Design a binder for this molecule. Structure first.
Ligand SMILES: CCN(Cc1cc(=O)n2nc(C)sc2n1)c1ccccc1
Ligand SMILES: N[C@@H](CCC(=O)O)C(=O)O
Ligand SMILES: N[C@@H](CCC(=O)O)C(=O)O
Ligand SMILES: C[As](C)(=O)[O-]
Ligand SMILES: [Zn+2]
Ligand SMILES: [Zn+2]
Ligand SMILES: [Zn+2]
Ligand SMILES: [Zn+2]
Lengths: 259, 259
């Protein structure tokens, strides 16, 4: 019986450093939605675990011409972690190389603007040029636009992939800072979950506008054919049905919202 | 190469008899979201199929005494069908005996009222007796209330399980008709998908009120360990990422709206 290595990512409010983390040890250094969820999954499946932050700070993408997976997906694919408990989006290209539980949280790509920005939709972004816009790198949102055959989204991708300087950012935090610092001249495309969270945080100067561009979910991921997969899947469904996932969302998004 | 037997259920707008069904044969008798979905799934997985309407007209529940499954779930469990393509809710007790694809559509339990009924929430229903309320039999909504430790819902189940005359119905259509003819003295608990569909159909006298009580999804189901399960799962994700599922939702819900 071995300690399960959990890969996750510093992404608020999923996993964050506790204020006093320096004086704490192991799993106690972290807090957030996925820290709470990991404890519950492990309890219900009966395993001990170690939270580890993914080394390259990425979600997971396959390099073209190198074909190596980076991020949390890479940690699973190459045997460095036993399970990923993170806001990791269920996508076809990932499900081909790793296993996902049923989803524990729903989301869709969405638009973040600085308040007052003259934008209400993706169509709006696509039909103008004054306001720049981009996505996270090495994630499922970038891939959505890269692959889309829908005219509005193809138009946005054609713009974003060629825009200079780059409209892509390394972390969600970078995208949010760029929105806040650009006086309305930058909009950020990110998952509704993260958008909704930031909307509840000081300085309360951003907001989600328009509907979501797609509809999908986060899943708990394991290496393909892992024996952990079945129990983890059943645990997600149990925690869903018992209302835990709704409680955790309220706790980390809304209960202590600052706006 | 064998023709795949698909079990499904007559439930609008998922599977409906075409107006001219009496002169049509086989799969062409039927239309709707799940008829379209079946055709897409079959094309991407490369099989031929026959749509069959579930014999007992039920989704699926286990008899507490005999432990025998009925409905579509039973047809899969006992080898009568190869796959279920229907608004079949992903649940823990079901996933223990059959396999589900990743979800193709989201839903939550919701309240249907006759327009003008003084009800805004589940909490409202629980705190009164003038307006009776019930659910579908042999489905996931009934099981939700039976197994709910949440205060308001637990209170609701105690009322419903002992209600006389019975507040439970055999079909969604029976529930809706009961709302429409009870002059506001019956409210129906049903999935948001079906609620939102009915609200857009003549005679436009019903309404979805309040938020959803939970958050979950429908999946394509296969018997445990079936060879079809893998391909079906990937096909759902492909259709999701293509925007096809969104297209079908708009086609059958809102393009066909008449209120
Ligand atoms: C997260 C709660 N859901 C809803 C949900 C999640 C999700 O990824 N997608 N993708 C779609 C395409 S429709 C949808 N609905 C859920 C949870 C467990 C089992 C099924 C659903
Ligand atoms: N959740 C995304 C990362 C965030 C984004 O791409 O917007 C993923 O799994 O790649
Ligand atoms: N979709 C439900 C049936 C409808 C309901 O229970 O409200 C099921 O799979 O059981
Ligand atoms: C397994 As428990 C009810 O202590 O989270
Ligand atoms: Zn620190
Ligand atoms: Zn628990
Ligand atoms: Zn197709
Ligand atoms: Zn009770």
């Amino acid at each position: 019986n071995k300690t399960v290595v959990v890969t996750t990512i510093l992404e608020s409010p999923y996993v964050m450093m506790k204020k006093n983390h320096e004086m704490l040890e192991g799993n106690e250094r972290y807090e957030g939605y996925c820290v709470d969820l990991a404890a519950e999954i492990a309890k219900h499946c009966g395993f001990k675990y170690k939270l580890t932050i993914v080394g390259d700070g990425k979600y997971g993408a396959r390099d073209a011409d190198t074909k190596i997976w980076n991020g949390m997906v890479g940690e699973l694919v190459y045997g460095k972690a036993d399970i990923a408990i993170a806001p990791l989006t269920i996508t076809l290209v990932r499900e081909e190389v790793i296993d996902f539980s049923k989803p524990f949280m729903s989301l869709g790509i969405s638009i973040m603007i600085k308040k007052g920005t003259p934008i209400e939709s993706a169509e709006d972004l696509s039909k103008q040029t004054e306001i720049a816009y981009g996505t996270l790198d090495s994630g499922s949102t970038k891939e959505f636009f890269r692959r889309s055959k829908i005219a509005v989204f193809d138009k946005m991708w054609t713009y974003m992939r060629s825009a200079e300087p780059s409209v892509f950012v390394r972390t969600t935090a970078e995208g949010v800072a760029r929105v806040r610092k650009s006086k309305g001249k930058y909009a950020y495309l990110l998952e509704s979950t993260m958008n909704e969270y930031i909307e509840q945080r000081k300085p309360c100067d951003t907001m989600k506008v328009g509907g979501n561009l797609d509809s999908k979910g986060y899943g708990i991921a394991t290496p393909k054919g892992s024996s952990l997969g079945n129990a983890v899947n059943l645990a997600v469904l149990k925690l869903s049905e018992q209302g835990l996932l709704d409680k955790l969302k309220n706790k980390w998004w809304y209960d202590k919202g600052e706006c």
